[PDB]
Amino acid sequence: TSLYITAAPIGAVPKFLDPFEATFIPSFLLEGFFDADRCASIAADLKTDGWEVVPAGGRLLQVGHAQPIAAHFPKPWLAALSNKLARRIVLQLTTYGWIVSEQGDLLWEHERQHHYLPPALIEAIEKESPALLKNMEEAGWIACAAGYWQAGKARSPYLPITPEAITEETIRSMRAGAAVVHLHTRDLSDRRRIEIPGLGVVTVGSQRNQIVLDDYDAIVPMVKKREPAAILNLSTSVRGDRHGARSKLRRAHLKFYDDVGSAPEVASLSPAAVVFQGGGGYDNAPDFLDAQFDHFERVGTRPEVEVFNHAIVDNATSLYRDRLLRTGKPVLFMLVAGVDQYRRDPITGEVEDDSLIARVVREEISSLLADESADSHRRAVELAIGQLRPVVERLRASFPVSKISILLPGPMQNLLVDVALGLGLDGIRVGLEDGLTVNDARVPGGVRKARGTWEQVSLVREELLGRGATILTAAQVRDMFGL
């Protein structure tokens, strides 16, 4: 039993959160120091960036954020709470860059901070433990009036979005055990600093998923200089930018890199429209795909078939089969399990479920994971394997020389190892692209923000080794895939 781990550090969806910026803007400073039109302008800019309106009742911990006009949260405090509340608090504070100590306490290890918790969280605390709320207030958590909150929804203070940060995370993820690194770039050109009197500076920006050629011209040679073994897997997705679905840009990063003596080893390829139930998908038309295949074959790049849906299973195993065989064996597949998908009827325009794990069953799996019992967990595993099994069998039957991996969205990654071994898969993918958390038994609630994709790689490797599995390295993977 040999598996290879894929690291996916960036992706399309999550965003970077600067743990040192303000996370609360009181309405009084905003309305107080701007004309109604520029006040409405900033407020609109903040909402776009994910800031949300909150009433009075929040608590703010501010230290050293002086704009004139305890960094501890101990385990016994979290232990006073239900597991759900403790988890909300731990996730919120680790999103803000607090860490879990070896004793299971939360700790902020810097001298300045501006960290806010919403009225709904505080009300929940007041109801479970008035003594805790008093303890927080004694530690310097102060009552707030209405204003604006940066939740950090799908955010992480460890998300790499620049060539330097991405190179570094790629290197750490490889040294932690990953053989393949799947990459995205982000467009950071719309970043503005908004200055608010009494508060300081808040930076806004979309961090939009986008193929950025200059970023790759930097990242690709930078990675290969330090870790020439790296098997780079470049995203060709235009999620977010659905107008670019036919564009040459979706293969322009897949070139021979002079500094490196090679084209990227791997690139994603989805042989059908990808229509997220959550919204924001992108087309992959037959004429576009023909051009992608011609190009991969020319520059020596192996497609990774992204199995988002049944349309793709069907297309890959019939029409595109010979093209996939031509681009090199083994043929590579990634099961995008747990992400709900539509298929659209082109004649009527109606959509129907086309997910690998049927939405109803995925919904059932998600509720089982929230019972958080071993019994429920077994059930969840059963259900996932049951949905995915025929897909895996179909792929195996059509491509006897193939490697299949699996990913799962954050709150489902507890299933990864069991499902992958249960299905006989060849590899597992983890990373901030898919999930932002790790389990940590030391802390109440047992869940916190991952310190990076490297950490998730390290945990999955560890769990795999204790199942007796063997982990392949990048050199082994490269040799055994002929890439």
Ligand X SMILES: O=C([O-])C(=O)[O-]
If binding is defined by CB under 6 A, does position 12 make contact with ligand X? yes
Contacting residues for 399 by C-beta, under 8 A, at least 6 apart: 317, 321, 324, 325, 330, 331, 333
233 touching Co ion, by CB under 5 A:
no
Q: Minimal distance in Å, beta carbon 336 to ligand 2KQ? A: 5
Give, in order, the Cα–Cα distances in Å from 284 to each of 113, 241, 243, 358: 45, 13, 11, 22
The CB-nearest residue to ligand X is 239
Q: How many residues bind to ligand 2KQ according to rule CB under 6 A?
A: 24
Residues 6+ apart with CB under 8 A from 454: 7, 169, 172, 173, 175, 176
Relative to beta strand 2-7, strand 180-183 is parallel
* Structure letter (DSSP) for residue 391: H
Phi first, then psi, for residue 249 (nearest 5°) are -55, -30
Between 86 and 174, name the residue whose CB sits nearer to Co ion: 174
30 vs 302, which CB is nearer to ligand 2KQ? 302
Is 305 a binding residue for ligand X by CB under 6 A? The answer is no
Residue whose C-beta lies closest to Co ion: 235
Among candidate residues 429, 404, 432, the one with its CA nearest the CA of residue 331: 404
| Residues numbered 236-255 forming contacts with ligand X, rule: CB under 6 A | 237, 239
Nearer to ligand 2KQ, 168 or 304 (CB): 304
Tokens 């074959």 identify what position? 297
Q: Which x/- pattern, by CB under 6 A, does the window 254-293 give for ligand X?
A: --------------------x-------------------
Residue 153 is a binding residue for ligand 2KQ (CB under 6 A): yes
**Residue 8 CB, nearest distance to Co ion (Å)?**
6
Tell me the CA distances in angstroms from 39 to 27, 35, 116, 459, 473, one per residue in order: 10, 6, 21, 46, 54
- When the beta carbons of 239 and 302 are compared against ligand X, the nearer one is 239
Reference 274, options 235, 321, 319; nearest CA is: 235
Distance between CA atoms of 190 and 188, rounded to whole angstroms?
6
157: number of Cβ within 10 Å = 17
Rule CB under 6 A: is residue 154 a binding residue for ligand 2KQ?
yes
Residue span binding ligand 2KQ (CB under 6 A) among the ranges 138-146, 292-300, 385-393, 429-437: 429-437
**What residues line the site for Co ion (CB under 5 A)?**
235
Residues that bind ligand X (CB under 6 A): 11-12, 209, 235, 237, 239, 274
Interface residues with ligand 2KQ (CB under 6 A) are 13-14, 87, 91, 153-154, 235-237, 268, 306, 334, 336, 339, 407, 409-411, 433-437, 447
